[PDB]
Amino acid sequence: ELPKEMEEYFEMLQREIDKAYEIAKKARAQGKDPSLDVEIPQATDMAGRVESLVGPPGVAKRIRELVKEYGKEIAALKIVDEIIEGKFGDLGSREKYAEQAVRTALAILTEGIVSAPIEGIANVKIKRNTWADNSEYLALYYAGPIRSSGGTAQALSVLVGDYVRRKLGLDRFKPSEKHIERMVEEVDLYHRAVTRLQYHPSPEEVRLAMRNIPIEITGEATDDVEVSHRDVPGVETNQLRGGAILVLAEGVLQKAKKLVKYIDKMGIEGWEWLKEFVEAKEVDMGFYYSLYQKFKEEIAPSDKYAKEVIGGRPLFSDPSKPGGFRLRYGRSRASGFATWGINPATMILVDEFLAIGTQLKTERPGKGAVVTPVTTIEGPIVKLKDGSVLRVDDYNLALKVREDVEEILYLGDAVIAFGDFVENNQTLLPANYCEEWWILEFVKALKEIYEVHLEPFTENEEESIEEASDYLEIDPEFLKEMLRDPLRVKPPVELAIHFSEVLGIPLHPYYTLYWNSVEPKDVEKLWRLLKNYAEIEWSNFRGIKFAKKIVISQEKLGDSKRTLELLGLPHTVRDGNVIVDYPWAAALLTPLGNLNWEFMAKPLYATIDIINENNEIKLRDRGISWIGARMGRPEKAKERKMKPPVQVLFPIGLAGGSSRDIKKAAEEGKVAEVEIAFFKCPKCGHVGPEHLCPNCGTRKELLWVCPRCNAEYPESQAEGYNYTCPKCNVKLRPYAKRKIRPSELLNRAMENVKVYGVDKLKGVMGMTSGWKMPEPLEKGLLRAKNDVYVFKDGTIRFDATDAPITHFRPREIGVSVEKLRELGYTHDFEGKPLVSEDQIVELKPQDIILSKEAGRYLLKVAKFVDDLLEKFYGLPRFYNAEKMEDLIGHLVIGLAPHTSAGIVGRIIGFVDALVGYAHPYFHAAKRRNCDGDEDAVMLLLDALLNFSRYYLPEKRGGKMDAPLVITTRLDPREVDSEVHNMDIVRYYPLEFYEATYELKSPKELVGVIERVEDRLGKPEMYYGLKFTHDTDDIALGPKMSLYKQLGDMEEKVRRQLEVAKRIRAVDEHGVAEKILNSHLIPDLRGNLRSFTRQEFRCVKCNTKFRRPPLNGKCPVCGGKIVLTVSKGAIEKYLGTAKMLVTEYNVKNYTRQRICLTERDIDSLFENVFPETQLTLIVNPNDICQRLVMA
């Protein structure tokens, strides 16, 4: 099957996993933990995950056989049929069968990763249609966690419910009119009062969906809002049901296309209404003039991304505005999943608001992306303070030049993958001319004329190179270098002109200016001025003349300097003269034929059209497609802490104080009463919250207590009683309210682990599980000593933004070649042996690259683990690391904030950014998209030792973010569907570029460009992926966003406004103000409204009063009453709002709203805070009184 390398890779991964698991088992066998074994099983494929998560036992082989024979959907259907009939045992009532079938089928369709089956589906019940016919139907109860499962999981849940109800011989739901009205008002209310819904269904759509769904979509209450249509039959609540209405809105409705596709593939009938809903929902001119008109007609600008701007977050471009982001088709080494490629120069020159990993809301392909440094694409063109125009394609040049920048003429490039267009089904935009298109035209012309075969981006035969060099009269070494790396090696301008003359191809894109950004009449005036009042120095090369310098006076140039700047032409101004130097003089004069032919403006023509019609050297439109973007959600590489930081899962109650400090309570002699689980030693009879008896070191047993009665029964005796009190008729509980003395426990712990000098030790106010089993205090002491925190399930986690990578260089990650050869890497991505640090190596599917903050924190985590192994269990240490570079070769676990299964990865290097680099398969296996998402990482051994299922909260949602199972191998066939559209080609073919001009759809050329989906099944899924664009460094550029270094809101707004003013294609002056004023006005008006209807609270307690007490003091205290909405929380943004109103031109509506808001704020407090203080001077240049007096 697999070759002799990937199998060995997986074998070594399994070997390391076994090495860790043996130590974890040996440590756990001693009985100092809630269980006597590890509580994280390891799986290998989807069937094992499904069996471990939902069951039933023995289903793995059946799932494997059915998916092998028919396919995923048909296998799920056969599994449903087999469960219903009774292959997998006897469950009981039909409700059990229905619930099990729904859960298992949803797990199979969902690949058993996200916890929608586990926690989304609260319960399954059979109800009766009493009001209509007294029939029997099925209802699905949706909890809170289903609200974060995605659109696809909910629609498939409805489909599975329908299939199971049809297979169980049950009738359909027949709602009354009151049900419909209740659902419409609920949909209307939730959007108004809770959340934007990310989608707004029309009322008629809601009526149609309610009338044509054979099951009842219901649930419990999740919002504290009352409804109007009350006491509806069959509905047991009078409040908003967020789970069901979100399922209806974002499930069968928003994802109707995928649902009908699944219906077609699945052989399911009875859903014709959804299909119908989907079907209903679904002269003499120039070449470029027509192209522009057609492009504007078919593809229209999208404004949905820039509808809102938050203060401090800049807007970088207007929709489809020239001068914004230049669209380039390709995929870099560390981009392609959903991320963009950006030059570091345009990161530096926008005031460092953009850092590696900073998210931005995009317009054309999708909505949202993450930026990654690419050093082969072009950077911004800027205008300096003295008048010079410069091209900043470098990072150091930008750092040197930043302080002199007056205006940013052009913003730069953005590399967007073809798979991003395929996934979102976005019509192809016309392609800007670039070096990769030029090299293909070059080789094609060479073959057509001289019959010589050459290919770019590879190595060619010496005979062909010699023949081509002889025919072109060039140096063979130069030809080899330029064919090997067209994106970095460019010919001189004279050589490019010679190539265009001989072969007959357009000019090299590097020497083409933005000729279509100006009008033909402006070029006419500029041509006249150049002919009349200019002096030019000419040259010669192979019989070809080219300009070497242009000198024209400023007074003679006039207002054509703006035309020069709009072409992106670099020049300089000295003592009244504007000078154009050597490389950029022929870039301006050669297209105009060296002034040999007159330039004249013509209607229905463009500048490039006239140039091509008259000149002999041909040109292509260098910039025609532009993109809009807006900043949002800066990158993150921080560790995870609870809302109050916690270091041990031990309840303290109120003895610890406001910070729940256990040590402070222990040192003050306080006694505390809390609910915990007490364990009792069978031999001597010790009692307390400890798993081991200190006197004899023999494992105790949990005590079960009656709720009303107060009899304690050990576990062995309670087993016989069926966990019910014999003298009573009430079920037992493992916990009760008891009193504890922290002094003895903390002294015993300190003596146990020999850790005495710890100042603070924070716990919890109370436990959330149903067991209320506490944690040993020794672990808390060791965590406090090493400065690490804990999570809800007993693990230490680190959150970071995720970015993709497929190929790497040993110098970027700081690892020697010998170390890599020890890890297993022996070749580079071209088959050559690995002997250098500048060679490009291909990443294995489960190898990850950490940041340096992550390494710094994992050093402390490893030290804590070693201390735990040496002091608590008495076993040899494992990591033995003194620096972060010593963690290389060790394993981690990657977990997503919405799933319940993890995946094993390996550490191979570190970077100096704030992102998490890994393979696209690694991010897809966690159901992540990599366009702003964040995930957690933890060391494998720490999770193995520390995780427990008895610390998980008992409510719905306590099983999300839990490593209930971990995958030990990667299979691209069952990771995701968005990663199946990614490109694996070295370069795009000429046909793609020729078809972009026809505005085709990406589906028409799926077979032309190879994707991931074209390799599934064959052994070469992990073997030969490739990339299009190259980058010098993977972590070059700014590392932290400026937004995190600004304190005041006024400072944030001012900096964002200077940024918007610098960029030519933003138009801040009014647009950014009006859009920004819809972020401060909501705050002002909402705070003003909530002030007059607010609740008061005691400082000593947390009890809240809906009405202020008449005495002014807490009735059950002496403490004083404080507000929940202060007066200063209303007028905190009024100064910035007034500044925004006065310094810019907004519509009169917003100005009057601001003035009236200030007047209302003044008038509301008339009798409470009268104006009793005068002032020396009046009229502080305020605008409200000026408007009133006008």
Next chain:
DNA sequence: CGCCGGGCCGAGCCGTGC
């Protein structure tokens, strides 16, 4: 020997027509 004042910590809160 008795204050003044900082610097942490922990609470709460963020458009809406009858």
Next chain:
DNA sequence: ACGGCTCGGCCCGGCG
């Protein structure tokens, strides 16, 4: 849309 913004109390250093 949610981290950013107001309050209140509680020790800990100087400092005279």
